[PDB]
């Protein structure tokens, strides 16, 4: 349908659609054979050797183009067979384009965009511009002249440099002033680029290895999109470029990227243009369209043709979508324009085409070409209109397999890149130097690219304007409005001169970047660490692979980032029936060295990213995981972007005295325009993050993918150096294929990348969320603050007019402006990988915290990256076993002060907010404590703010708005109680607040007290948070606190419970107080099913047994406490059998021994398991006398199935089988300790307390009982 004829190059000229034609030219040119494939479109199967007369030869120029790939073949397209093929290829690709909805539609838009007329020195007349036509030589020798939208030519010298070109003018900028001009696309369908992907691995697992081929239909689309902008005269000025910093050692020596090009690629590249600049352009071309409307309007005459003025006026109406009235006058409708322009600029885009063809394509212009390939799409066995390369019902139909240059190699011939590998380079040295290819360096966009008007204040009226993202659905609603006929006519025009004089539109100006350029640096950089991984490439037999560079200085210069284990293994020295081998075993190490994985925002960390690239920042050595937790994604970045959110311009509202309606209208406008404003700022930050951060991460991502490739090649090579010294013989006797060894390691490498991608995805979002967005959210909250005052002052001053609605509105205003407009990445980004990363990032409330204190690598740090500073008092004490546990004593140097960053805090942050922590409050011992409320967490500036405080049997939360008065919520517990859930045991506190409602205090996930705070405040938000015993009048007192958190919202019930389970550390067992259960440490035992009893032994040895006897004492201090005695019975010590753990913590599923102290002598707790029946009575046996008796115990903290539990001790026989959990038999007699499998069968069917429910109780100063 799109091209109605087949053509053959040999078909004879006919004057109509096969003709020798002439073109605009500087001086004289000779005619060339062209074929009119469609109304207004011609093809000239001929190398372009005449549009640019300052390129004579088709040879590589003396000084090389600054492009990563280039290809010269001065004999290409020199014969007729080639010319025929070309014609056929180009036809095929138009058919491929026109067969897609978006294609059918671009091309209709192209045929429709006749270049304007244009010429006319006279205001009143319309004349054709000559450069927008060709002269068509007829069979008889005469010539007709013909208008022309677009022409495809063969390419110039650099075959793969595909361009849109036009002929210019003395004065008019035809491609930028709405007029448009004929477009000449230099193109070939006989070649294509190679690029690499490392992203589809996460959707497409068994995928490729090497390069992939750009589908040439996409390349031709790219060019037609350009042609589209230039035919409607809306191309962006080429002086308008995305300027890059260039002076730093790591920065790309140089790189032109024009805004026109960014626009044309679309997808995430189009998002580098900020809203301000985007709007500037839309307004500019809107006004250029107006000037065309007003040119048409003055037109009373029309020369050089037999068509009517009206007819021609009507062609341009349809092109520009003008509105005509009854009087014949024309005008541009802002709405119809906005849509047209959107379509041309935001819909017609390369990224959108990729969606329609379903091809793999570079994803951003920054993903550079790496190769060039000869192809041949004409035969259907190679390439169809419908599938391109990826042919249905074949091996090629699957994972973009058709475009994999390895798999479909019968279809892509590798060609020479005429750009040297170090043609363009910087030279990095260390105070050894290495040339580094310019296209391997970082993109650093200058801050000048990023402009906004966020600082400008705005006046809101009742008039004020209320606005008003590109899915496939939206594209469909455009398609459905199209009119797919009334094609613009071919019309007679009067002969131009036989030689049409014209010069190509003159472009800049632009300059050879200085070529490297030495840099003396102090550290080895990641490029050095990357060059070390390379070799050599090479022959004999070197490749002594090793760590610690200088490797560099060989070869074998061959650095690796595993582990002599590996360097040693594959630097032998191995043959030959032990090849095989060796081989088997290296396929293993690789997939354990590379699939290797290991904080709650960056879940998955790959710890060899450090070593491979030396990250980066890169001073070491390789606990890159340590440094990552300590500092967050910022250690990856090569440069730290600046986040420059200015004080936002505020709104002032216009009053409409005595006017109810305009006064409410103006409120509504104020609020909606606010909603716009968050959007504006969010959008700004995302744009910033995309250009400066997410690009650094994607480079690193590719560099990893390469590092892996580097290692698998070095390994493959060292194998063959061996297998070759051989057989050989047999040799013909272990018929092994590197081609299947390759297959095995790529599967491996892809698996690694699924992890690495994921890890780096999370690094990207986490930086966005915790180091960029917050700076915005603060300026946004001050903006609200100030809008709220204004709006309430407005509602107050016009209360006369608003008699019936002063509440409804104040409530509307207070409800609206008290609530954060949530950030949704999907609003700003189209890209499902980042979107799903972000959804998972949000899923965890902790990532949203504004303070997240944790002990990591030897300091207490804020993991949310909001604390400006954390001052730790000299006499604070961190539990040597779990340094997250912090002891603060009643000394003034036992304090910790946290200070939030000024640029991130706002006055209203404690209006809906929450805090959680765990605390261990020792028992109160002394009477002075009976009436002594003391502070322990204090956030108060001159009387206002919040604090957490303690008194006898109480935890107190207190808010004080704004210079008095208070509100207060309280949790109360008794010290006259047998066994307390609370006294001296770790408890989980959460305080939530909602200014318009009430504060709530929760304890271990349970709501205790809530109380209205709607009578306040406001609260003065303090910079400081002091952790300190303040006012405690017991000299000897202290508290333990840990896992402090602060949140900027009010947590619901469910959130609070999840948070409780997440911080419970359920992989680890705990003693009675809540501290980690430890090895080699005495514990008194409390059975939870009979807690008024304790353990004893009637007799040592197999004759004796252990039993529960009662009662336990009491312990008391008159008027202060009365509790069951807990330091009773025979003590238990848990001993190591199996381990790992360098450490002393008893973990879930550890296999242990249980010793039992009797009279200061330890015995082994054991039993005869073949004793008849389910219950096996336990005994205390002499340590060296256990014989083959059952003694190994599996410590448990959860069941299965995951439900946590208090049944700690599953005893096992010496074959590995369950005997039973340890509990007690009775109700019979005599409360012996037994192991019973009955217990194992209950725990799976219920979580109730059972006879096997134990708690271990160590001595603790906070309990104070005296043994």
């Amino acid at each position, epitope marked *: 349908p799109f091209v109605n004829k087949q053509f053959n190059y040999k078909d004879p000229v006919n004057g109509v659609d096969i003709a020798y034609i002439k073109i605009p030219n500087v001086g004289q040119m000779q005619p060339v054979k062209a074929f009119k494939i469609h109304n207004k479109i011609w093809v000239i199967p001929e190398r372009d050797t005449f549009t640019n007369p300052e390129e004579g030869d088709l040879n590589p120029p003396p000084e090389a183009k600054q492009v990563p790939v280039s290809y010269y073949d001065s004999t290409y397209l020199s014969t007729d067979n080639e010319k025929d093929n070309y014609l056929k290829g180009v036809t095929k690709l138009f058919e491929r384009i026109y067969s897609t909805d978006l294609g059918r539609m671009l091309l209709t838009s192209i045929v429709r965009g006749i270049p304007f007329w244009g010429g006319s020195t006279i205001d009143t007349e319309l004349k054709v511009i000559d450069t927008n036509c060709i002269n068509v030589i007829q069979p008889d020798g005469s010539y007709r002249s013909e208008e022309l939208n677009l022409v495809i030519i063969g390419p110039s010298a650099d075959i793969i440099q595909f361009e849109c070109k036009s002929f210019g003018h003395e004065v008019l900028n035809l491609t930028r002033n709405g007029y448009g001009s004929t477009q000449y696309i230099r193109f070939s369908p006989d070649f294509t680029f190679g690029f690499e992907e490392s992203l589809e691995v996460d959707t497409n697992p068994l995928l490729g290895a090497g390069k992939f081929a750009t589908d040439p239909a996409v390349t031709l689309a790219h060019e037609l999109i350009h042609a589209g902008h230039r035919l409607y005269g809306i191309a962006i000025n080429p002086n308008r470029v995305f300027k890059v910093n260039t002076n730093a050692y790591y920065e790309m020596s140089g790189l032109e990227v024009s805004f026109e090009e960014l626009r044309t690629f679309g997808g995430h590249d189009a998002k580098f243009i900020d809203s301000l600049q985007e709007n500037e352009f839309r307004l500019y071309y809107y006004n250029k369209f107006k000037d065309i409307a007003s040119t048409l309007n003055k037109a009373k005459s029309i020369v050089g043709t037999t068509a009517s003025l009206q007819y021609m006026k009507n062609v341009f109406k349809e092109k520009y979508l003008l509105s005509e009235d009854t009087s014949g006058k024309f005008s541009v409708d802002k709405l119809k324009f906005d849509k047209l322009y959107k379509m041309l600029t935001e819909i017609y885009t390369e990224d959108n085409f990729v969606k329609f063809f379903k091809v793999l394509n570079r994803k951003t212009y920054l993903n550079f070409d790496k190769a060039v390939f000869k192809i041949n799409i004409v035969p259907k066995v190679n390439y169809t209109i419908y599938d391109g390369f990826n042919l249905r019902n074949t091996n090629l139909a699957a994972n973009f397999n058709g475009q994999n240059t390895e798999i479909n190699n019968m279809n892509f011939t590798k060609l020479k890149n005429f750009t040297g590998l170090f043609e363009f380079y910087k030279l990095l040295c260390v105070r050894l130097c290495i040339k580094v290819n310019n296209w391997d360096l970082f993109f650093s966009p200058s801050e000048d690219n990023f402009t906004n008007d966020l600082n400008k204040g705005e006046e809101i009226t009742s008039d004020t304007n209320i606005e008003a993202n590109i899915s496939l659905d939206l594209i469909q609603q455009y398609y459905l409005t199209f009119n797919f006929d009334n094609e613009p006519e071919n019309i007679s025009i009067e002969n131009l001169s036989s030689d049409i004089i014209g010069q190509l539109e003159l472009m800049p100006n632009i300059e050879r970047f200085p070529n490297g350029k030495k840099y003396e640096l102090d550290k080895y950089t990641m490029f050095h660490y990357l060059r070390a991984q390379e070799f050599e490439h090479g022959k004999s037999r070197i490749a002594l692979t090793n760590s610690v560079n200088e490797a560099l200085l060989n070869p074998s210069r061959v650095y690796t980032f595993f582990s002599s284990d590996y360097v040693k293994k594959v630097n032998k020295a191995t043959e030959a029936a032990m090849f095989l081998g060796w081989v088997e075993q290296l396929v293993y190490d690789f997939t354990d060295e590379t699939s290797e994985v290991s904080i709650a925002d960056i879940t998955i960390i790959i710890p060899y990213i450090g070593p491979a690239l030396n990250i980066g920042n890169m001073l070491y050595k390789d606990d890159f995981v340590g440094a990552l937790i300590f500092s967050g994604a910022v250690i990856l970045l090569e440069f730290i972007p600046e986040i420059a959110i200015p004080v936002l311009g505020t709104f002032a509202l216009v009053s409409y005295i005595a006017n109810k309606v305009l006064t409410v209208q103006t409120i509504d406008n104020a609020l909606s325009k606010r909603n716009e404003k968050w959007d504006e700022v969010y959008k700004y930050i995302v744009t910033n993050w995309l250009a400066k951060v997410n690009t650094q991460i994607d480079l690193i991502r590719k560099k990893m993918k390469e590092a892996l490739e580097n290692q698998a090649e070095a390994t493959k090579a060292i194998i063959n150096y061996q297998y070759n010294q051989y057989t050989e013989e047999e040799k013909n006797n272990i018929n092994f294929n590197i081609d299947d060894l390759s297959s095995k390691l790529n599967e491996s490498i892809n698996k690694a990348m699924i992890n690495i991608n994921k890890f780096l995805n999370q690094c990207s979002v986490s930086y966005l969320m915790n180091s960029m967005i917050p700076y915005g959210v603060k300026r946004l909250e001050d903006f609200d603050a100030s809008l709220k005052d204004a709006l309430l002052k407005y509602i107050y001053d016009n209360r006369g007019t608003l008699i019936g609605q002063v509440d409804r509105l104040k409530d509307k205003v207070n409800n609206t402006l008290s609530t954060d407009i949530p950030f949704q990445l999907s609003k700003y980004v189209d890209n499902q990988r980042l979107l799903s990363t972000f959804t998972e990032y949000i899923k965890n409330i902790i990532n949203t915290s504004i303070l997240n204190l944790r002990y990591e690598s030897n300091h207490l740090i804020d993991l949310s990256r909001y604390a400006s500073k954390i001052n730790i008092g000299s006499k604070v004490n961190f539990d040597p076993i779990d340094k997250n546990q912090i002891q603060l004593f009643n000394l003034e*140097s036992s304090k910790i002060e946290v200070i939030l960053k000024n640029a991130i805090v706002y006055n209203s942050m404690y209006e809906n907010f929450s805090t959680s922590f765990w605390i261990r409050i020792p028992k109160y011992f*002394n009477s002075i404590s009976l009436n002594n409320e003391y502070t322990i967490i204090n956030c108060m500036e001159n009387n206002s703010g919040w604090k957490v405080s303690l008194n006898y049997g109480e935890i107190i939360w207190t808010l004080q708005d704004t210079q008095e008065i208070k509100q207060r919520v309280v949790f109360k517990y008794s010290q006259m109680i047998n066994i307390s859930d609370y006294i001296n045991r770790w408890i989980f506190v959460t305080i939530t607040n909602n200014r318009l409602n009430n504060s709530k205090i929760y304890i271990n996930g349970r709501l205790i007290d809530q109380k209205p705070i709607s009578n306040l405040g406001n609260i003065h938000a303090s910079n400081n948070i002091m952790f300190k015993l303040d006012g405690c009048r*017991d000299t*000897h007192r202290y508290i333990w606190i840990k896992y402090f958190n602060l949140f900027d919202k009010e947590l619901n019930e469910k959130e609070i419970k999840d948070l409780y389970d997440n911080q419970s550390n359920s992989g680890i067992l705990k003693d009675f107080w809540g501290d980690y259960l430890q090895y080699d440490k005495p514990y008194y035992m409390l059975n939870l099913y009979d807690p008024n009893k304790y353990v004893d032994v009637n007799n040592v040895g197999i004759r004796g047994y252990m039993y529960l006897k009662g009662p336990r004492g009491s312990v008391m*201090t*008159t008027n202060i406490y009365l509790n069951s005695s807990l330091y009773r019975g025979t003590k238990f010590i848990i001993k190591k059998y199996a381990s790992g753990n360098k450490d002393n913590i008893v973990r879930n599923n550890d296999r242990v021994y249980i010793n039992v102290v009797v009279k200061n002598k330890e015995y082994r707790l054991a039993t005869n398991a073949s004793q008849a029946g389910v219950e096996k009575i336990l005994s205390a046996l002499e340590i060296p006398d256990v014989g083959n008796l059952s003694q190994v115990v599996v410590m448990k903290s959860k069941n299965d199935q995951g439900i946590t539990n208090k049944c700690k001790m599953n005893l096992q026989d010496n074959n590995g089988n369950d005997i039973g959990f340890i509990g007690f038999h009775q109700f019979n007699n005599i409360a012996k300790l037994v192991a019973s499998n009955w217990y194992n069968r209950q725990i799976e069917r219920s979580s109730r307390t059972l006879g096997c429910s134990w708690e271990f109780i160590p001595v603790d*100063d*906070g309990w*104070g009982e*005296r043994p």
Partner: antibody
Amino acid sequence: VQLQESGGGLVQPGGSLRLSCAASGFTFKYDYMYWVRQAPGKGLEWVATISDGGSYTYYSDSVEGRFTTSRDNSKNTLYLQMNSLRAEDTAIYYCSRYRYDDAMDYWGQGTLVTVSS
Amino acid sequence: EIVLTQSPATLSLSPGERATISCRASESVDSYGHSFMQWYQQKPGQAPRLLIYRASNLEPGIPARFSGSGSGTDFTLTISSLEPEDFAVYYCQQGNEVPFTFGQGTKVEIKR
């Protein structure tokens, strides 16, 4: 490592006086400091304690409202402002360091306060 | 106010004999697993000297003949084998809570 306490002397009933214990040779600014007194040929009596930062003070009920203890961590010095003195305040006055969390381990020589017309 | 009754009030004993002075609290003197009873020795014209702290801990620099014991409300300082250098007034002192308080004194006189 010693404490020299000065300020002692004769003073009229109802009058006033200020003692100054001068610490050297150890980390004053971290230690609670106590004032203790002993009327001639009689028992030891605790007067007052002051926390390391100087923010929290304790007084024996006999001298409450009437004596004030302060400190200056920068000049390693401890102070006892002493007002509306009575006959029964006649005593030798000792400052001592409290070694947390044990006992008062270092003491000065004392200084004699005599209250009489 | 915790009152510490110390006895015997006077004690006269030959060198090399055992001295057992005994202190008794009106209320308990224990908290946080400790008993904050201290024992001091004062000689005429000298500041009191720490002997024993938290009930049972000998102060470094003080010789072994001094031991301390007890808990709760009843504490005891014994001098294992007296010297003539030990004529002093010995004081118990609580540190458990404010008001921190002293015993009334016990006068070891030496016999010859």
